[PDB]
Amino acid sequence: ERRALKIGVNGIPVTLEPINAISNVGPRIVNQIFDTLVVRDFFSNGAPGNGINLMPSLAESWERIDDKSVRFKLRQKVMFHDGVEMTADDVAYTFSSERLWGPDAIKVIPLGGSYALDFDEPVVEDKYTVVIRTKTPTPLTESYMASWMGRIVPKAYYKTLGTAAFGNKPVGTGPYKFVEFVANDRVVIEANDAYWGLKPTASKITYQLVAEPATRVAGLISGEYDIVTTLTPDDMALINSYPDLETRGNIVENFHMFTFNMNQPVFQSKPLRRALALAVNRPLIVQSLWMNKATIPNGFNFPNYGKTFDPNRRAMEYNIEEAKRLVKESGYDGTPITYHTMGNYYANAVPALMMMIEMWKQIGVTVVPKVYAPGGAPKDQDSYMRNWSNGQWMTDAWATMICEFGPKGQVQKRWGWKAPAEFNDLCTKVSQIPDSKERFDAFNRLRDIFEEEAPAVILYQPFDVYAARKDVHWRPIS
Numbered sequence: 001e002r003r004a005l006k007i008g009v010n011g012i013p014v015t016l017e018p019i020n021a022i023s024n025v026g027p028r029i030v031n032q033i034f035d036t037l038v039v040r041d042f043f044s045n046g047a048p049g050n051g052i053n054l055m056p057s058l059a060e061s062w063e064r065i066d067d068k069s070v071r072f073k074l075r076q077k078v079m080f081h082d083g084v085e086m087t088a089d090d091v092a093y094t095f096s097s098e099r100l101w102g103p104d105a106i107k108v109i110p111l112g113g114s115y116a117l118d119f120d121e122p123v124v125e126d127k128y129t130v131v132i133r134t135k136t137p138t139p140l141t142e143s144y145m146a147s148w149m150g151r152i153v154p155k156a157y158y159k160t161l162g163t164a165a166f167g168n169k170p171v172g173t174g175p176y177k178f179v180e181f182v183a184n185d186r187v188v189i190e191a192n193d194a195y196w197g198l199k200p201t202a203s204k205i206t207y208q209l210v211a212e213p214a215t216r217v218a219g220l221i222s223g224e225y226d227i228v229t230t231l232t233p234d235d236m237a238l239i240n241s242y243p244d245l246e247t248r249g250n251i252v253e254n255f256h257m258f259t260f261n262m263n264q265p266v267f268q269s270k271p272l273r274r275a276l277a278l279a280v281n282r283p284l285i286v287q288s289l290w291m292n293k294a295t296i297p298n299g300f301n302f303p304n305y306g307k308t309f310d311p312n313r314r315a316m317e318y319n320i321e322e323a324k325r326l327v328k329e330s331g332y333d334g335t336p337i338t339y340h341t342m343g344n345y346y347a348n349a350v351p352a353l354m355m356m357i358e359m360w361k362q363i364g365v366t367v368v369p370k371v372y373a374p375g376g377a378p379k380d381q382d383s384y385m386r387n388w389s390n391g392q393w394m395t396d397a398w399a400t401m402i403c404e405f406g407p408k409g410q411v412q413k414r415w416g417w418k419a420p421a422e423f424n425d426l427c428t429k430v431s432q433i434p435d436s437k438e439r440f441d442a443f444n445r446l447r448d449i450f451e452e453e454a455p456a457v458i459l460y461q462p463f464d465v466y467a468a469r470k471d472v473h474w475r476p477i478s
């Protein structure tokens, strides 16, 4: 039959506008509402779910014409949820200066510019043919279209409503259509049997916020939820002891971190940031809370970067001697510094924070936990330390070092990181040269500067665990 799925989740996105929903909790919903032109084959080249060969989706075919331009031939008679046919005009709009990457687009998609390629205006050749262009050369256009930046929006409806209102009543081409959105509580979507692709296999999907992981585990056990997300390896034995239930876990291409508001005088310079960084004992946190399943990367450096992955890079440094030394140099009065966390939105956010509070006490710093509820985030002026994550969404080190931490990103712009000039010039350089020894060495230079400056501190890649009924064979949680 087709069941109504009930999914207990760690969090609900602030919006369903597909770019502004980019987070750990938005994509699992917006990937059902919207489609992309092309998709990654997660099992290509023997890959165990992290493959990269690109396959047709809204685009039936595509041809790279030159180093700046890619022609996409679109499927025909694809319907948006309101009965409007998708055409090249919609795809052009999705990647337009008006909506995405122009100067005024930043007021409503604040991060569109930092996460955009160096686009020029798309060209519509006919109803079903669109050419995506870049002002400067880049080989990333095609894989970018398979990413969370590539979800196709309906031009007329979206432009009429505007970005914010569209985010509360989204219309897409995907296999599920919008029914309801209750901020900080739930999203309901229903089967779209007019979908161009395979017929939806669930009648409806409800994403219900269940803040505490033990409540999600109990809800799965009692049948209140069919699927639950964001568990840890410690929950696996209990769940797997029920023959009707199971867990699935794997290392994700995402890192957990803590970061700083660098507009605050206490974090305006590198010494205290680097001190907090060098006192984090990662193997201890991983052994205590992750059953040694979370992995510690050798810097801001991940295997999915391909040609810009360094398999021989050194480990990130643990040095409480230098940390004590840097605390004293900064003239640290001894005042408590807040660390904001939205409960366990990140798996093990609170138990990891309590272990780091003890580690920072052992080097002279007093950090206090400020645990808040969804929607109760502090104003920037009230934020000092906070936890975050970054999903490594491209097969190139451009994401997320340059997206997030580069001169156009939110870490320098919104959160006040005054990066060294060499860092910003290297960011500009790597974004205009092809893969080579020079490009490889330049990213290693950027990684070195990142660790010297500590605008953020990388903890580990979590071992992401979800769980479900065995008789629920399709799980829309990524």
Ligand SMILES: CC(C)[C@H](O)[C@@H](O)C(=O)NP(=O)(O)O[C@@H]1C[C@H](O)[C@H](n2cnc3c(NP(=O)(O)O[C@@H]4[C@@H](O)[C@H](O)[C@@H](CO)O[C@@H]4O)ncnc32)O1
Pocket (backbone or CB within 6 Å): 014, 022, 023, 024, 025, 342, 345, 377, 378, 388, 389, 390, 391, 392, 400, 404
């Ligand atoms: C316009 C405003 C109403 C806005 O929509 C609303 O979201 C808001 O008020 N945000 P803000 O004032 O910043 O309030 C908090 C303070 C902090 O900036 C917080 N925050 C930012 N990112 C996340 C967030 N990020 P995430 O880790 O789930 O997602 C990251 C993404 O943040 C990241 O872009 C991507 C690629 O690196 O990797 C991950 O998907 N998770 C929980 N809170 C977040 O939101």
